């Protein structure tokens, strides 16, 4: 149980290090934000 | 001229409708109008 708890606690440590270092980790959400912002910017630019 | 109130307007034959206000847009001395992403007029220089 001490080993299993320490392995869990350490692996939740690695999640914070990944998310703090690697902004591209969220890339599947940033893709959806970028696609919707690009669709509106295309719609507004088409008024010109 | 009227400011901070919704008005219909015409500058030099450029008609529109909006709240006119003073601005911090640093027009270079040759520039007469400003434009936004749609080519809609964002700002104007007053001819008076």
From Swiss-Prot, chain A:
It comes from the Viruses. Residues 1-48 are annotated as: Heptad repeat 1. Subunit of the fusion protein that is processed upon entry into the host cell. Mediates fusion of the virion and cellular membranes by functioning as a class I viral fusion protein. Contains a viral fusion peptide that is unmasked after S2 cleavage. This cleavage can occur at the cell membrane by host TMPRSS2 or during endocytosis by host CSTL. In either case, this triggers an extensive and irreversible conformational change that leads to fusion of the viral envelope with the cellular cytoplasmic membrane, releasing viral genomic RNA into the host cell cytoplasm. This is Spike protein S2'. It comes from Severe acute respiratory syndrome coronavirus 2 (2019-nCoV). The lineage of its organism: Viruses, Riboviria, Orthornavirae, Pisuviricota, Pisoniviricetes. The gene is S.
Swiss-Prot record, chain B:
Changing residue 38 to D: In strain: Alpha/B.1.1.7. Binds to host ACE2. RBD also interacts with the N-linked glycan on 'Asn-90' of ACE2. Cleavage of S generates a polybasic C-terminal sequence on S1 that binds to host Neuropilin-1 (NRP1) and Neuropilin-2 (NRP2) receptors. Interacts with host integrin alpha-5/beta-1 (ITGA5:ITGB1) and with ACE2 in complex with integrin alpha-5/beta-1 (ITGA5:ITGB1). May interact via cytoplasmic c-terminus with M protein. May interact (via N-terminus) with host bilirubin and biliverdin, thereby preventing antibody binding to the SARS-CoV-2 spike NTD via an allosteric mechanism. Changing residue 15 to K: In strain: Omicron/BA.1. It comes from the Viruses. It comes from Severe acute respiratory syndrome coronavirus 2. Attaches the virion to the cell membrane by interacting with host receptor, initiating the infection. The major receptor is host ACE2. When S2/S2' has been cleaved, binding to the receptor triggers direct fusion at the cell membrane. When S2/S2' has not been cleaved, binding to the receptor results in internalization of the virus by endocytosis using host TFRC and GRM2 and leading to fusion of the virion membrane with the host endosomal membrane. Alternatively, may use NRP1/NRP2 and integrin as entry receptors. This is Spike protein S1.
């Amino acid at each position: 149980q001490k080993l299993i708890a320490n392995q869990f606690n350490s692996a939740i440590g690695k999640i914070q290090d990944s998310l703090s270092s690697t902004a591209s980790a969220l890339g599947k959400l940033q893709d959806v934000v970028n696609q919707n912002a690009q669709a509106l910017n295309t719609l507004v630019k088409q008024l010109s | 001229l009227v400011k901070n109130k919704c008005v219909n307007f015409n500058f030099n034959g450029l008609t529109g409708t909006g709240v006119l206000t003073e601005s911090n847009k640093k027009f270079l001395p040759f520039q007469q109008f400003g434009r936004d992403i749609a080519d809609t007029t964002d700002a104007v220089r007053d001819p008076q």
